[PDB]
Design a protein around this ligand. Structure first.
Ligand SMILES: Nc1ncnc2c1ncn2[C@@H]1O[C@H](COP(=O)(O)OP(=O)(O)O)[C@@H](O)[C@H]1O
Ligand SMILES: Nc1ncnc2c1ncn2[C@@H]1O[C@H](COP(=O)(O)OP(=O)(O)O)[C@@H](O)[C@H]1O
Ligand SMILES: Nc1ncnc2c1ncn2[C@@H]1O[C@H](COP(=O)(O)OP(=O)(O)O)[C@@H](O)[C@H]1O
Ligand SMILES: Nc1ncnc2c1ncn2[C@@H]1O[C@H](COP(=O)(O)OP(=O)(O)O)[C@@H](O)[C@H]1O
Lengths: 235, 235, 235, 235
């Protein structure tokens, strides 16, 4: 019956905003390597939504080249007049973004070739801007160890988040107006299982839509009805 | 002599609308795997008919590629200016649908290659929208098990409907104004045989057109005259 | 200090030999679909080792065609003079194997195209012999449903083994001369975890080589020392 | 404990031998159209095994052409010196088989093109021999209706067998030494379900191998244990 919150600031969100603003204002490269289902994509989307001079793209294996990634960057910077070449595209990206004190955000940096990430680091080094990587722990694990070693000298900042926190899901429950202590422990048990923010928000929206359709309050019984579903331990 | 109902809300329809709104507002992927003749196509059509920011396509083996599916999507989103390439088409689809909080509905997801469904999940993950699959039980059975395993982490919701319910055909009979208890049992016997909604609506419209042509009421005799046809147990 | 047994007859081995001799003497097709680590490969190898007029090949994705599979068959039947064509190869395979009352054994039948398995079933139907498939549960799950439906009429026999039995690991412990009841329960706990025969034989040979290097008897402590290794619950 | 019979003469076998010898000595074309699992393949194999001047091939969709079928015929007639052309191959087949008063047997004649079956009927008409077709009821159903109409004038004989008989399974039970009346009725119930000879011989060999492994007689309980398997009514 109250509003379902689309987002809440957490301890992990306040950490990743600190590292984000650090990589931007420092104008240096930071890696966010950690297991997904923790919210780094939506946190970076929230940062780009709140703050200007911030740019965030995604990288697919269908867009794993240098040219496709720079085309994504040209679409993100607001330039539909991107040349199909690699050279003058790169120099136009260098022209547009110089002096902006901007921030480039890279999601799924584990799908990168060495030439692609090398062109991105030489780009940001020739632009005096900040670069932020996302993905699993393989993003850092592809570097330990000699081809990204100068990049390992440029990579100074990383905040690695494997699993969530107690105050993390506590602030989430505060956003969703949850005060049951057994409910708190059950949400922590949800946070124990992987895909934590995903499975958590699934269970929360199931319980919320159930409590609105039945006209009631989300209780621990609606949490058991939601979390008992989704077939997580089914092989 | 009264109006033949084109649609009725059922328990299965109320379940699949719940899962549909869940996959949309959750902005995550849900699978509807189950044997056909249960009404999932017309229920999704009804949901798109009642609700805005909702998009539903179909997938044929003649349109089983990435490019044909994205062309279907571009036709569904109202963009006749779709480029024939795969790249700028995908980025235009990403531009148009971002911020819309929309819902993509996929019918017959059993005909999918791994690259096609991978491009769709990377699309919706780069669009912050909801994706709904339809088809038989092979849609989930193609995943159990490693190539869609990260998608099995994204696939959290599924409502599997094999056969219908008693209150299902009861609400259908209430839409068709049927109060015979033997008529109720005979409609349940229709629901026992597969292609349940198809064979059921066939028998209902035969009995209705028969009762209008003879100027009478649909009785159990018109139900036997309709259901005795269609040659279901003929080899 | 006694001899480590390379093989023991089990209840599952006696079942799969029954189904094997049934598919051979019946001269019809039988499917063995079940999760691996149960010993179906070594049981079929043991059957071919003990019995004549028995042939067993493997199928890789590198040999997933009709021609490569029939080349494997020609190598298995003892014919190095196999033509590189598909036709006269198939007719020579039909000539050599007719009247032999033989048995063809197929391992990893989940990697099959429809043309390959169709050529194998038309081969064995034109040879009056038995065909045995192996693999996971996807071997049968690729048929439920119309292209292998006549093959589903030819497939009459299947013995599906998901997990092991109590008398299974009891006979294994009897082969390895184990009489501890807590040791029996711990071997059953090994059998609970998947890759059951693989992980079991790994733990047994670790404990046996440890007891021979230390000059002792395999105890429950050597079982904990072996089974505590292998890093099964490590992510 | 007695010998499992590989074959028994039935009423259907005595009928199909009558039609077989009729098509041969008449030197004319006969069609055997009927649902499989009735034993027409093994009956024709038995006829070729007992009788000389008898030839039986199979036809696959991989060998659906004229040339592949005549190559099968040249392999069946004992001529490995078959030319790869269509002409001199056909004339050598006409030379070898003239004056022999032979019999050509065709299995799965439903996979035939019109040119293939036309070349076979012009072959046998230019050889003064007999031609026998096998397959489902579609073999005759592809002719009703003008392109095989002169062949419908040459096709004078057909014996269509859809399902088995009481004396059929009675003679089978006499071959398998079965004297239980409830056992007789249960074997008739096996004969009711399609794939009759296939499912029947499967159940018989399961009960026989079970009675030999347990050292007992095949009873009605072994028939229930065999026939209760095979998962026939499982979807
Ligand atoms: N503050 C928040 N409150 C609730 N859910 C959140 C929050 N931030 C992120 N999420 C969740 O995170 C999920 C996606 O992030 P995630 O999958 O962890 O990204 P990645 O795959 O890049 O690690 C979304 O389903 C969203 O519900
Ligand atoms: N509420 C309803 N009342 C009556 N019939 C329905 C209803 N919803 C769906 N149907 C029937 O469902 C049929 C088509 O759905 P279906 O074939 O089950 O889709 P799919 O093939 O994707 O499973 C239509 O013939 C329609 O008559
Ligand atoms: N009788 C037996 N005693 C001990 N181990 C066995 C026996 N039969 C099979 N195995 C084990 O089975 C393993 C391989 O079989 P498996 O991997 O299950 O085949 P598949 O992969 O085809 O299922 C081997 O490691 C072997 O040790
Ligand atoms: N006299 C017989 N006694 C027992 N079984 C028989 C006999 N004749 C044929 N069969 C059975 O018929 C089966 C194959 O024939 P079938 O499949 O009917 O041929 P088609 O597929 O061409 O119709 C075999 O499994 C064999 O066991």
């Amino acid at each position: 019956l109250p509003e379902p919150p689309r987002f809440v600031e957490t301890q992990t969100v306040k950490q990743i905003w600190t590292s984000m603003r650090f990589a931007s204002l420092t104008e240096s490269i930071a890696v966010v390597c950690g297991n997904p289902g923790v919210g780094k994509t939506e946190a970076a989307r929230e940062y780009r939504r709140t703050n200007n001079n911030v740019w965030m793209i995604t990288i697919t294996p269908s867009c794993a080249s240098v040219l496709e990634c720079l085309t994504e960057l040209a679409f993100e910077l607001g330039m539909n007049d991107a040349p199909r070449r690699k050279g003058p595209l790169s120099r136009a990206l260098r022209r547009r973004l110089e002096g902006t004190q901007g921030l480039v955000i890279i999601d799924e940096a584990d799908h990168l070739g060495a030439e692609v990430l090398e062109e991105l680091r030489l780009l940001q080094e020739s632009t005096r801007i900040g670069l932020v990587l996302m993905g699993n722990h393989r993003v850092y694990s592809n570097m330990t160890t000699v081809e990204f070693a100068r990049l390992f000298s440029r990579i100074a900042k990383r905040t690695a988040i494997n699993k969530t926190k107690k105050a993390d899901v506590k602030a989430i429950a505060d956003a969703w107006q949850i005060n049951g202590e057994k409910e708190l422990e059950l949400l922590q048990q949800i946070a124990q299982k992987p895909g934590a923010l995903r499975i958590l928000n699934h269970s929360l929206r199931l319980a919320a839509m159930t409590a609105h359709g039945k006209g009631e309050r989300v209780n621990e019984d609606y949490l058991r009805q939601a979390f008992r579903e989704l077939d997580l331990d089914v092989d």
